Amino acid sequence: VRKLKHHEQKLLKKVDFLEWKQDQGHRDTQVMRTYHIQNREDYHKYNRICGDIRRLANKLSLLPPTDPFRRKHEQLLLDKLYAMGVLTTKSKISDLENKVTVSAICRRRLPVIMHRLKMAETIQDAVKFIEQGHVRVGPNLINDPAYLVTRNMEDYVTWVDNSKIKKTLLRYRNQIDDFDFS
Amino acid sequence: KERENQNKFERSTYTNNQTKDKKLRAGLKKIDEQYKKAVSSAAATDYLLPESNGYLEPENELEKTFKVQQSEIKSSVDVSTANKALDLSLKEFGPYHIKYAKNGTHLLITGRKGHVASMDWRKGQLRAELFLNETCHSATYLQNEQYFAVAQKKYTFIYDHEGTELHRLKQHIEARHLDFLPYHYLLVTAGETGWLKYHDVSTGQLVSELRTKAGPTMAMAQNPWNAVMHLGHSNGTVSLWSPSMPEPLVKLLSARGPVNSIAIDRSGYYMATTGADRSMKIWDIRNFKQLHSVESLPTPGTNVSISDTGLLALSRGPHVTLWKDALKLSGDSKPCFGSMGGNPHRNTPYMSHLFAGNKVENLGFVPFEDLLGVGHQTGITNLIVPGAGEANYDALELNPFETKKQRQEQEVRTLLNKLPADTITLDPNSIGSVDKRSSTIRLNAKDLAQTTMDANNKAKTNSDIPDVKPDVKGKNSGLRSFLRKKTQNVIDERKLRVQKQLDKEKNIRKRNHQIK
Amino acid sequence: SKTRYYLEQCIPEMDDLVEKGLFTKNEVSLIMKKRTDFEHRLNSRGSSINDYIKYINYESNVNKLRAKRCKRILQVKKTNSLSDWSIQQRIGFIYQRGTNKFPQDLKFWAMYLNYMKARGNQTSYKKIHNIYNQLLKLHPTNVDIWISCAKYEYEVHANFKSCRNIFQNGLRFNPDVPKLWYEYVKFELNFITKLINRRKVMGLINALRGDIALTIFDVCMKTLGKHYINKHKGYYAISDSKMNIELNKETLNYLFSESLRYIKLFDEFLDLERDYLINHVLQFWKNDMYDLSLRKDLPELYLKTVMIDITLNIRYMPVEKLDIDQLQLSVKKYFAYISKLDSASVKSLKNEYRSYLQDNAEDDPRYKILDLII
Amino acid sequence: PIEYLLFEEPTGYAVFKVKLQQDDIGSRLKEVQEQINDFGAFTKLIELVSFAPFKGAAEALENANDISEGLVSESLKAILDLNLPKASSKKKNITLAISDKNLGPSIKEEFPYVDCISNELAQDLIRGVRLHGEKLFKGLQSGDLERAQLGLGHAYSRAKVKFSVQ
Amino acid sequence: MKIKTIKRSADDYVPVKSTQESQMPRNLNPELHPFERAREYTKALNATKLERMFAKPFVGQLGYGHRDGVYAIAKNYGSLNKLATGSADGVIKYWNMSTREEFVSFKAHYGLVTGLCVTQPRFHDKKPDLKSQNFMLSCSDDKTVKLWSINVDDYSNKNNEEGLIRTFDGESAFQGIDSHRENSTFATGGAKIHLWDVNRLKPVSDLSWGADNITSLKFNQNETDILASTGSDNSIVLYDLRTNSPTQKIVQTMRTNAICWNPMEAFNFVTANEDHNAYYYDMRNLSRSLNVFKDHVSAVMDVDFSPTGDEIVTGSYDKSIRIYKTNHGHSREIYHTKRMQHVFQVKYSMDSKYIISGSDDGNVRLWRSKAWERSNVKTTREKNKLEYDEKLKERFRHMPEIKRISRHRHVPQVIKKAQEIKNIELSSIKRREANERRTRKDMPYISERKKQIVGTVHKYE
RNA sequence: UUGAACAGAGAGCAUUUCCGGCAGCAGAGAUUUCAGCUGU
């Protein structure tokens, strides 16, 4: 912590007060900084599900390469994860080990969907807006940031009517019709 | 040269249950002269000791000492100590587990709800106030005020000086008790799982996982002398543990029911354990005798603590009660609650206090000052306990006035002389010695030749066989115990000549019986 | 740390001082915490000779309290154990440490010398010699240390050989201040006066002259003149002959004023041949000084030396029998001066008349003297 | 053995006493070469025993010319005769470390019991006391040494060139 | 009720003025300082590890070496840094070891210069100028002993006819030379050992036991009139110069390459011989060595004592040198280099801190006797730390974890393989002699310290 | 290599030669300390 001299750094090399090997390079912290994750245990709650997908993918690739059970369940899991939005392509089954990843499950969260739909300028702005209760999917208002938005369910991410944000974008283009409140 | 206080500075040694070498004789004579000179000159430092310990003394027979009030102490003592006797009223988060740094400079409080605050309690400087909204249980500093470990809902977390999270420990699954071993740099962890985990803070490496095998760990304390961990279980059993042996070093049967709290003296000699059977028990640690058994407390003692000058602070809910000279051998030092008719041979409380609103969570003496910090349901309260602190610290072990540069260099130096976790034994003086195998006389290779000679001639002299003796009640004759302890189906030449010498013994016993 | 070493060097004397039942443990802990304060201030950074001085004053005060408590408790004046010299030895070592650290304040060096001399029979004069040797080594140019060294070894020990060696070594180092010259001629006159008085005393019970003082007087004039002509006109001799003769005149004025002070404090040694010992300085000043003190300027100095040579027998009391013997010598002196001088003639006449009138029934013989010097 | 050290400087003469010898064989090594830069270890080698200051700039210029052309002046004779012990002239002379190999013969011409050393050990001892300067002297001189250096350099140069102000 | 608490007061613990250091109160209670064995065990382990990383013993080679391998070296016992070395091609050189550069070189002879030493030549007509001239003399196999003077810049007292002031002459070759430490005398071994003085051009006395030649020579350092010599009949002969005669000889198994006398004990010497070990002998009893220094793997070429008399240095024909504590009998240290071949000469400098080795590729190299030890002057904090660490390594010396670290060196491949086959050979002969002793009746237990003397004239009673 | 007288150093080593005991008395310096004779 004091920038050890040469004899000290030679004499105690494995000493590190910040980065440990159980930390795994602080990647929970790293991807929760990237996608602005509030609570500490969401990374590991997603890591359990990525481990489920990859455990099944291992145990399913250990079946013989031609039997219809392996082919049906590999294709069925691939279709389910593409439809949910974690996987970005349902083509190859090496996605079920390589491209299945806590960052993919985190890119499917509601503020990241928002920021990619240009509905907020950054992920922290999207977090603030859906905490303030501006965003509804479908009819019903969504209030928490961790909400996972599937591919067919991202067509209905809008703002609530009577939103001040909806009002100011309509009045920026002065398409505001005050009959329907915005 | 005489030095009335030498036996504090003396050092025990090995005994057998003189020499002809001239050079070795004079070397041992120089060694004994140097040991005597070193003990005498080290014991003459008590002149150089700057301060004197505190006290309070009754000066009357109507003036008992347990009925002296904290406001009366704060009026009778100086303004600096009266300002050290702090009181934080933190009502909304839960009962506050208290913890002090090993020099008394920093305080670390944890609410049960989420509120963990590390602070310089004697200035007005807090340096971490973090609200971790899951139920925290305990915390401790590591080697400094610069890092602290908190035991949260499940995982133990480690935070830096300003409160940023450094580590989430994926092991240490449900801690309720954390304690740091400062000479070994080990964070020790126990809790609702029946497991005890030693984690090296410097390297970052989980040193030991030990099955307690006795359910959740109800209490936990560290021997400051030899760094073994006394855990108290729901059996009424204390067990002394080291990170080398996967079994407890010792298991003591302290109480009935569970064991609510354990405290160890800093000399490593006495241990006070409170059980849930309303029983405080003072234990000898070195010889494992039970010194005192104060049974039928009015309500179960939820905490015990032992100061640096040997006070005993027991806490039974609202009440805190301190006894002076209770950790002694004689039966006149058994801690009583009243003196039946004014008996001078009854250890009445040295002082007591009642936290009338609440139930205290834990106790901890402030290290080098005369205070007892008790953390309770509505925050923190320091109590001015006058006999309760080492007045003369050593400033190169741990210094209450240490600066930033001194903290930096002392951190690097103690990190450099970190003791390995394998050197933790029940006695600290057992890592210079020889094995308790490997014969106590050193061997001069003439007797090695003699040993290989009788190993060659174990046959036809039967030196590895019990000797023939007829008069030894031949149902327990040694040779038949050999024959019975051996497996009864294989046949080797050793057991053949034991059978031969056994028939010889039976025939000699037969003829001795016949002539008798 | 070395404060730890010094503090635990202090413990056997208080072992002994608790065993001899004069101090108690609670008061000796108080003197140890005060001494801890002082030792830490001594051998830490930012140290001061006032820290040394206050430590010496504290140790002398606890020594005086120890002596008072010994006389009141044990009713002896020393316990002849460790605790009656250890504290004076401590004071001497604090002085030695201070003079090794700050060897620049002569106040502290002289406090060391004063305490070491006043320690009495218990100290050693070779121990005073050692600190005189190292002090004179560090300050060879400071001249009062040479005077004090020689004064200690003559006015206390009466060691004439070593005192002569000290004065000759000091005059080797700084042969430029006249104060060391005057104290050397003072020492030589004191030594020859003690020599002839022990001769007179051995006569009254039962060759070697002031020519030593005259020879050191001669080299005093020569080397003081040389060092003033080298001190002024400092860097080079870039000065024309007007400035060279102005300089040489001024060095004659300087040197002759010092010899005027020499005779002025030379007259009071009246137990040797004071007439001869003043007349030899008169004849040493009478000769030529290479820039015409008589035949040119410093004629006022020539008149001063003529007045001195006139009154050199008339240095007498109002009992003027010597005047009635040899006032014709003063008359011939005034005649020989007024045979050449022009305004110094009237000046010397009026001055000798005023001097004889100021210095000299009894007014009727003084009326004869007034008629003589009228 | 390099027992004493003579440092000449514009304020006067200094005699130092060598406490600890530096290494002879390891004299080119890195630690021995930078212990004369560290002051905390140079004060383990050198201790000041005497400093005779000059009488002024006139005696300073006289002694600067005498030191320049390699002669023992009278102030040198005084300070060396005060400080150096009366050793023998035939067996174990006292050893003085100078910086001038043609000032050495003038020192043995006056004190035959003194052998003079100016080789690389005496040279780096001398440049150690030159590198530290005012710190070794413990406060005992009048006048800043660089101010006396400016005055003495200008005086020496004008003397050597015969600078006339007419 | 009287009452008193801890009044810390802050004037005694944090200082008033900022320029001065903080007070460090001590309290020597073992309660305050708990792990007193483990803490200094770890300090002794960190001291052994710090020594094994600070061990940088090679100082430097001096000059450019010679052309044909250094076979003779002599220090002068009065100056610290001066060293004379001679090679196989007859060139000798005088060295300043401070600057690592030669004062002078000399084409001294035509053959090998087989010996050289240094002198203070007591002429009784001239006076030796030892403050500006150094003197080295040197014998070769071309039947000549030559005496040379060297211009030396060590004092600056003076301001000159340097080389070859005289030429002693023998009829047969010479093989060793050593000078008496007084009285103008030296001795040369060769076909026969002669005594000489620097005035006469012929030997004063021939002091030879028999008609068997002499390979080496050393004079004693105190009791300076006792000589010792090694003859090629595996013989070690002592001579006395009061009686002007030989004194006693012993015959060993193999040939003694060198001797050096103990400079602090005056009757002990160490021989360095061709079975690969050194023998520490007492002059008053040559029937047993009083030590054997065993760790070399080829023939030991040269030995020398520390001037403290406490350790020896020992260079051998396996291209490595070894330093031995005098009371142990195994090597404290081994120095090797891929560039160093066949170290034929080793001296121990008069500082007792450096070790000069002359190899046979040409080079003369300086080493530190203590590898981890630096030669700066030390403040008292680092000096106290260093001697605390020395005492701590001393009292934990035999713990297995620090013994395996302090015992460790990197030895070359050839010496390591010779060492392990030497181990299995010695273990095999101990097995076979244990069997033979189990059977046979009267097998005497001969000591290791006697196992190498085949005989001794003037038997001991 | 020894001897002699001389000049010294404070840098070593003994031992019972005296003192660090008491007064009477004069002397010394700034009321405390300092300096010698007649006996205990």
PDB file of N, CA and C in Angstrom, chain A residues 11-48:
ATOM      1  N   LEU A  11      10.448  -9.821  -1.667  1.00  0.00           N
ATOM      2  CA  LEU A  11      10.215 -10.693  -0.530  1.00  0.00           C
ATOM      3  C   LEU A  11       8.756 -11.021  -0.304  1.00  0.00           C
ATOM      4  N   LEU A  12       7.840 -10.179  -0.750  1.00  0.00           N
ATOM      5  CA  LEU A  12       6.422 -10.491  -0.603  1.00  0.00           C
ATOM      6  C   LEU A  12       5.696 -10.065  -1.878  1.00  0.00           C
ATOM      7  N   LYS A  13       5.682 -10.978  -2.848  1.00  0.00           N
ATOM      8  CA  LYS A  13       5.187 -10.734  -4.193  1.00  0.00           C
ATOM      9  C   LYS A  13       3.692 -10.939  -4.298  1.00  0.00           C
ATOM     10  N   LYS A  14       3.159 -11.912  -3.579  1.00  0.00           N
ATOM     11  CA  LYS A  14       1.754 -12.245  -3.705  1.00  0.00           C
ATOM     12  C   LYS A  14       0.850 -11.338  -2.892  1.00  0.00           C
ATOM     13  N   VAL A  15       1.396 -10.347  -2.207  1.00  0.00           N
ATOM     14  CA  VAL A  15       0.599  -9.457  -1.379  1.00  0.00           C
ATOM     15  C   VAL A  15      -0.140  -8.475  -2.268  1.00  0.00           C
ATOM     16  N   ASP A  16      -1.455  -8.425  -2.103  1.00  0.00           N
ATOM     17  CA  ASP A  16      -2.303  -7.475  -2.810  1.00  0.00           C
ATOM     18  C   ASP A  16      -3.530  -7.268  -1.950  1.00  0.00           C
ATOM     19  N   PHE A  17      -3.793  -6.031  -1.570  1.00  0.00           N
ATOM     20  CA  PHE A  17      -4.919  -5.751  -0.702  1.00  0.00           C
ATOM     21  C   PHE A  17      -6.200  -5.470  -1.457  1.00  0.00           C
ATOM     22  N   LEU A  18      -6.139  -5.250  -2.766  1.00  0.00           N
ATOM     23  CA  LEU A  18      -7.333  -4.930  -3.535  1.00  0.00           C
ATOM     24  C   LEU A  18      -7.782  -6.090  -4.411  1.00  0.00           C
ATOM     25  N   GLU A  19      -6.912  -6.579  -5.282  1.00  0.00           N
ATOM     26  CA  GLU A  19      -7.275  -7.597  -6.258  1.00  0.00           C
ATOM     27  C   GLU A  19      -6.886  -8.969  -5.742  1.00  0.00           C
ATOM     28  N   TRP A  20      -7.879  -9.812  -5.519  1.00  0.00           N
ATOM     29  CA  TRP A  20      -7.663 -11.185  -5.119  1.00  0.00           C
ATOM     30  C   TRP A  20      -8.027 -12.109  -6.271  1.00  0.00           C
ATOM     31  N   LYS A  21      -7.738 -13.394  -6.105  1.00  0.00           N
ATOM     32  CA  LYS A  21      -8.058 -14.346  -7.153  1.00  0.00           C
ATOM     33  C   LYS A  21      -9.492 -14.826  -7.077  1.00  0.00           C
ATOM     34  N   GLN A  22     -10.114 -14.767  -5.908  1.00  0.00           N
ATOM     35  CA  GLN A  22     -11.525 -15.090  -5.804  1.00  0.00           C
ATOM     36  C   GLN A  22     -12.403 -13.993  -6.366  1.00  0.00           C
ATOM     37  N   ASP A  23     -11.850 -12.802  -6.551  1.00  0.00           N
ATOM     38  CA  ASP A  23     -12.568 -11.676  -7.113  1.00  0.00           C
ATOM     39  C   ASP A  23     -12.955 -11.892  -8.554  1.00  0.00           C
ATOM     40  N   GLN A  24     -12.203 -12.731  -9.264  1.00  0.00           N
ATOM     41  CA  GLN A  24     -12.324 -12.953 -10.700  1.00  0.00           C
ATOM     42  C   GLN A  24     -12.203 -11.646 -11.467  1.00  0.00           C
ATOM     43  N   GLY A  25     -11.237 -10.830 -11.070  1.00  0.00           N
ATOM     44  CA  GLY A  25     -10.952  -9.608 -11.780  1.00  0.00           C
ATOM     45  C   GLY A  25     -11.988  -8.533 -11.630  1.00  0.00           C
ATOM     46  N   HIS A  26     -12.849  -8.640 -10.616  1.00  0.00           N
ATOM     47  CA  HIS A  26     -13.922  -7.693 -10.320  1.00  0.00           C
ATOM     48  C   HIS A  26     -14.867  -7.534 -11.499  1.00  0.00           C
ATOM     49  N   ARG A  27     -15.356  -8.649 -12.012  1.00  0.00           N
ATOM     50  CA  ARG A  27     -16.193  -8.549 -13.190  1.00  0.00           C
ATOM     51  C   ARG A  27     -17.648  -8.348 -12.869  1.00  0.00           C
ATOM     52  N   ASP A  28     -18.090  -8.753 -11.680  1.00  0.00           N
ATOM     53  CA  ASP A  28     -19.392  -8.322 -11.197  1.00  0.00           C
ATOM     54  C   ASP A  28     -19.460  -6.809 -11.147  1.00  0.00           C
ATOM     55  N   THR A  29     -18.456  -6.201 -10.523  1.00  0.00           N
ATOM     56  CA  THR A  29     -18.326  -4.757 -10.455  1.00  0.00           C
ATOM     57  C   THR A  29     -18.191  -4.142 -11.838  1.00  0.00           C
ATOM     58  N   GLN A  30     -17.482  -4.817 -12.737  1.00  0.00           N
ATOM     59  CA  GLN A  30     -17.228  -4.260 -14.057  1.00  0.00           C
ATOM     60  C   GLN A  30     -18.488  -4.218 -14.906  1.00  0.00           C
ATOM     61  N   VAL A  31     -19.251  -5.307 -14.945  1.00  0.00           N
ATOM     62  CA  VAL A  31     -20.424  -5.249 -15.802  1.00  0.00           C
ATOM     63  C   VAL A  31     -21.576  -4.547 -15.106  1.00  0.00           C
ATOM     64  N   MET A  32     -21.570  -4.453 -13.775  1.00  0.00           N
ATOM     65  CA  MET A  32     -22.591  -3.653 -13.132  1.00  0.00           C
ATOM     66  C   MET A  32     -22.275  -2.175 -13.217  1.00  0.00           C
ATOM     67  N   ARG A  33     -21.012  -1.824 -13.431  1.00  0.00           N
ATOM     68  CA  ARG A  33     -20.670  -0.462 -13.808  1.00  0.00           C
ATOM     69  C   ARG A  33     -21.067  -0.176 -15.244  1.00  0.00           C
ATOM     70  N   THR A  34     -20.890  -1.147 -16.135  1.00  0.00           N
ATOM     71  CA  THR A  34     -21.256  -0.937 -17.532  1.00  0.00           C
ATOM     72  C   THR A  34     -22.753  -0.726 -17.689  1.00  0.00           C
ATOM     73  N   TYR A  35     -23.563  -1.615 -17.124  1.00  0.00           N
ATOM     74  CA  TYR A  35     -24.998  -1.560 -17.338  1.00  0.00           C
ATOM     75  C   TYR A  35     -25.763  -0.981 -16.163  1.00  0.00           C
ATOM     76  N   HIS A  36     -25.065  -0.388 -15.192  1.00  0.00           N
ATOM     77  CA  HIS A  36     -25.626   0.414 -14.104  1.00  0.00           C
ATOM     78  C   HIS A  36     -26.630  -0.383 -13.271  1.00  0.00           C
ATOM     79  N   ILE A  37     -26.103  -1.379 -12.595  1.00  0.00           N
ATOM     80  CA  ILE A  37     -26.910  -2.317 -11.839  1.00  0.00           C
ATOM     81  C   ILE A  37     -26.911  -1.882 -10.388  1.00  0.00           C
ATOM     82  N   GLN A  38     -28.108  -1.750  -9.811  1.00  0.00           N
ATOM     83  CA  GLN A  38     -28.247  -1.183  -8.477  1.00  0.00           C
ATOM     84  C   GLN A  38     -27.688  -2.110  -7.417  1.00  0.00           C
ATOM     85  N   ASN A  39     -28.283  -3.282  -7.264  1.00  0.00           N
ATOM     86  CA  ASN A  39     -27.935  -4.143  -6.150  1.00  0.00           C
ATOM     87  C   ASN A  39     -26.808  -5.095  -6.493  1.00  0.00           C
ATOM     88  N   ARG A  40     -26.074  -5.468  -5.453  1.00  0.00           N
ATOM     89  CA  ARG A  40     -24.811  -6.165  -5.598  1.00  0.00           C
ATOM     90  C   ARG A  40     -24.993  -7.587  -6.107  1.00  0.00           C
ATOM     91  N   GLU A  41     -26.135  -8.208  -5.837  1.00  0.00           N
ATOM     92  CA  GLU A  41     -26.281  -9.635  -6.059  1.00  0.00           C
ATOM     93  C   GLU A  41     -26.983  -9.969  -7.365  1.00  0.00           C
ATOM     94  N   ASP A  42     -27.220  -8.977  -8.222  1.00  0.00           N
ATOM     95  CA  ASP A  42     -27.836  -9.261  -9.511  1.00  0.00           C
ATOM     96  C   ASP A  42     -26.874  -9.937 -10.462  1.00  0.00           C
ATOM     97  N   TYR A  43     -25.582  -9.606 -10.381  1.00  0.00           N
ATOM     98  CA  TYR A  43     -24.592 -10.297 -11.197  1.00  0.00           C
ATOM     99  C   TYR A  43     -24.591 -11.772 -10.898  1.00  0.00           C
ATOM    100  N   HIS A  44     -24.647 -12.127  -9.633  1.00  0.00           N
ATOM    101  CA  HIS A  44     -24.509 -13.522  -9.292  1.00  0.00           C
ATOM    102  C   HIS A  44     -25.819 -14.257  -9.450  1.00  0.00           C
ATOM    103  N   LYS A  45     -26.938 -13.549  -9.320  1.00  0.00           N
ATOM    104  CA  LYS A  45     -28.218 -14.129  -9.690  1.00  0.00           C
ATOM    105  C   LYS A  45     -28.317 -14.397 -11.182  1.00  0.00           C
ATOM    106  N   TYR A  46     -27.642 -13.607 -12.010  1.00  0.00           N
ATOM    107  CA  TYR A  46     -27.577 -13.924 -13.429  1.00  0.00           C
ATOM    108  C   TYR A  46     -26.525 -14.974 -13.733  1.00  0.00           C
ATOM    109  N   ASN A  47     -25.456 -15.005 -12.944  1.00  0.00           N
ATOM    110  CA  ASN A  47     -24.380 -15.956 -13.160  1.00  0.00           C
ATOM    111  C   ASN A  47     -24.828 -17.370 -12.870  1.00  0.00           C
ATOM    112  N   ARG A  48     -25.739 -17.539 -11.913  1.00  0.00           N
ATOM    113  CA  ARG A  48     -26.351 -18.844 -11.700  1.00  0.00           C
ATOM    114  C   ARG A  48     -27.119 -19.311 -12.933  1.00  0.00           C
TER     115      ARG A  48
END
